[PDB]
Amino acid sequence: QLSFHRVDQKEITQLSHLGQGTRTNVYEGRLRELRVVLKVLDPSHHDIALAFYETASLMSQVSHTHLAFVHGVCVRGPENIMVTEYVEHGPLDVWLRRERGHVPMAWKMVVAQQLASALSYLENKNLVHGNVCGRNILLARLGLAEGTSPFIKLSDPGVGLGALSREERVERIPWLAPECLPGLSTAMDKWGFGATLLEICFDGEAPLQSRSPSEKEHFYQRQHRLPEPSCPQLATLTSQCLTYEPTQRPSFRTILRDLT
Amino acid sequence: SFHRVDQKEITQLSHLGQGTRTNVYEGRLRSELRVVLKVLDPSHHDIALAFYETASLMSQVSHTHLAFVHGVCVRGPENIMVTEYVEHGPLDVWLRRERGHVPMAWKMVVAQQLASALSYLENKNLVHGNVCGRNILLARLGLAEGTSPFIKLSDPGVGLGALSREERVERIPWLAPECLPLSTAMDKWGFGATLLEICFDGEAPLQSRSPSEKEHFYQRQHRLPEPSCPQLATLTSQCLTYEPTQRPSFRTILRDLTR
Ligand SMILES: CNC(=O)c1nnc(Nc2ccccn2)cc1Nc1ccccc1S(C)(=O)=O
Numbered sequence: 001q002l003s004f005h006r007v008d009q010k011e012i013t014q015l016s017h018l019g020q021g022t023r024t025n026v027y028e029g030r031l032r033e034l035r036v037v038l039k040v041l042d043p044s045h046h047d048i049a050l051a052f053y054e055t056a057s058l059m060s061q062v063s064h065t066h067l068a069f070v071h072g073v074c075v076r077g078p079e080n081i082m083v084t085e086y087v088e089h090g091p092l093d094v095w096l097r098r099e100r101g102h103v104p105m106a107w108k109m110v111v112a113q114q115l116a117s118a119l120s121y122l123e124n125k126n127l128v129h130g131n132v133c134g135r136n137i138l139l140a141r142l143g144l145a146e147g148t149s150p151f152i153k154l155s156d157p158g159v160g161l162g163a164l165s166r167e168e169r170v171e172r173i174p175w176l177a178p179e180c181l182p183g184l185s186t187a188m189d190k191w192g193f194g195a196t197l198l199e200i201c202f203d204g205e206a207p208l209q210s211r212s213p214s215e216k217e218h219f220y221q222r223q224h225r226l227p228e229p230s231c232p233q234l235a236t237l238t239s240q241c242l243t244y245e246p247t248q249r250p251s252f253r254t255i256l257r258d259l260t
Numbered sequence: 261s262f263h264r265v266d267q268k269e270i271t272q273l274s275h276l277g278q279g280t281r282t283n284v285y286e287g288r289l290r291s292e293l294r295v296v297l298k299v300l301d302p303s304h305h306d307i308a309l310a311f312y313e314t315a316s317l318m319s320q321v322s323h324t325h326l327a328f329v330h331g332v333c334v335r336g337p338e339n340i341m342v343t344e345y346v347e348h349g350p351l352d353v354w355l356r357r358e359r360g361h362v363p364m365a366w367k368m369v370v371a372q373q374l375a376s377a378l379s380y381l382e383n384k385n386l387v388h389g390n391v392c393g394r395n396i397l398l399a400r401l402g403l404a405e406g407t408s409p410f411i412k413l414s415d416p417g418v419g420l421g422a423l424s425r426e427e428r429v430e431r432i433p434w435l436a437p438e439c440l441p442l443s444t445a446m447d448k449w450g451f452g453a454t455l456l457e458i459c460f461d462g463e464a465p466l467q468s469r470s471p472s473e474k475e476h477f478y479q480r481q482h483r484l485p486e487p488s489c490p491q492l493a494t495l496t497s498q499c500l501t502y503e504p505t506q507r508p509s510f511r512t513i514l515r516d517l518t519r
């Protein structure tokens with residue numbers, strides 16, 4: 001059977017809208033009464049729902065201190081709701097943009113180590129995330145007080161990369177690995193981790209973000225490389241990760257070693 | 261007494277809440293540190309003096325369970341006390357959102373830590389005057405499995421001696437009854453009332469009840485409820501007596517909390 005827990009509609013209450021994901025609306029919710037996040041999938045075709053079920057399946061089969069927990073899935077007729085863990089401070093990118101110019105390098109290094117740690121665990125299990133970006137990095141603890149460190153939870157990838165259109169894949173540039181643009185290896189999470197490091201270094205302002213779909217696509221087609229981070233401590237690491245040859249990208253074991 | 265902070269050194273951020281005659285904000289202090297800014301309302305010199313005395317007192321103390329005071333900024337008609345920022349904030353708020361899921365072992369650690377901070381002030385013959393869950397801050401939550409709490413007792417804000425009868429009545433049940441019409445005996449009553457609030461998951465007795473009712477309760481010398489937790493029942497009965505001399509020392513309270 002299904003490799004995820006089934007949630008009955010009588011067990012869940014839907015509350016405040018928090019934002020939007022790829023083909024989803026995210027709400028705060030209560031699970032019979034635990035505070036949760038409800039990822040409501042748009043009215044979708046069976047191939048989209050199936051890519052969503054695969055994400056829930058994958059997440060239910062994993063357990064790591066830096067990966068957000070999935071409670072299960074609710075199928076209320078034409079609607080698919082993924083019931084997941086609620087993370088106190090929400091998306092990292094939003095927070096980096098609120099605190100721009102006041103985020104110390106030491107703090108960013110802790111986030112990077114924690115993210116590499118979560119991705120190393122998936123690598124060893126030969127599991128592909130497919131959507132590593134600052135928006136899917138959630139802050140459990142901000143680490144603002146003296147002698148406190150940030151604590152992140154990497155969210156589920158949402159609707160699997162394989163189910164998305166070219167337009168959606170182009171929207172995921174620079175986080176999307178270039179081998180994914182035509183359209184699944186763990187080598188893609190190494191590019192995604194690299195692009196996330198740049199976004200963190202540049203305080204939630206990723207390269208090419210303002211740039212149009214045509215421009216983003218043009219950049220990948222012509223094999224242009226992304227800027228070097230302002231931070232020189234992560235410059236080598238991002239140059240290695242952000243290569244167009246997936247085999248050339250280092251393992252997370254090496255990345256973790258290089259970070260610590 | 262206390263360090264003077266120039267307005268060019270601080271940055272005022274989000275509003276966190278309110279204290280007696282103050283507005284509390286998140287902030288940044290250059291040499292960058294995350295801080296809390298306690299902005300005093302436009303006030304008279306006797307109110308500002310009671311606020312300077314608090315800053316003075318809190319600059320002269322050093323304990324792992326007392327929040328640090330960086331100094332004071334004087335911006336136009338506003339007196340800004342620059343203090344330590346604590347990660348999780350007020351205990352009472354946290355107890356209310358986690359009601360029915362706070363273990364007795366956790367509450368016992370908080371009680372020991374609070375008695376420890378108050379024992380230090382008693383030995384130095386220093387009065388806090390505002391012991392309540394709102395003034396108890398969590399550096400470490402301890403709510404998660406395998407985490408233990410770590411509290412910081414905040415500064416008392418505007419000293420009790422500067423407040424009106426109206427404000428004193430609003431402080432019931434934390435306010436010692438001899439204060440309704442300054443000794444370290446008042447902090448024993450305050451510690452007792454805080455233990456009830458902790459036991460009742462941030463729901464203090466008489467909280468909702470009107471000023472007239474609160475005042476009536478003290479005037480008629482009625483005693484506060486026994487805590488649901490039997491382990492702290494004796495301790496709260498001893499602390500919450502109308503005779504200040506009858507209240508035990510923090511040395512005794514601390515000793516009793518180990519057993
Ligand atoms: C697995 N858990 C989550 O995904 C999740 N958990 N807690 C959150 N807390 C939270 C606190 C304050 C404000 C907003 N959020 C946000 C979350 N998702 C979220 C929220 C808004 C926009 C997009 C997404 S997402 C990652 O793309 O699903």
Ligand SMILES: CNC(=O)c1nnc(Nc2ccccn2)cc1Nc1ccccc1S(C)(=O)=O
Nearest residue numbers: 276277279296327343344345346347348349414
């Ligand atoms: C000495 N330091 C403090 O007093 C203080 N330090 N850190 C805080 N963190 C904090 C984190 C999250 C949410 C709210 N707060 C709150 C604080 N005060 C506070 C905040 C809101 C309401 C009343 C007061 S108070 C005790 O009456 O000053």
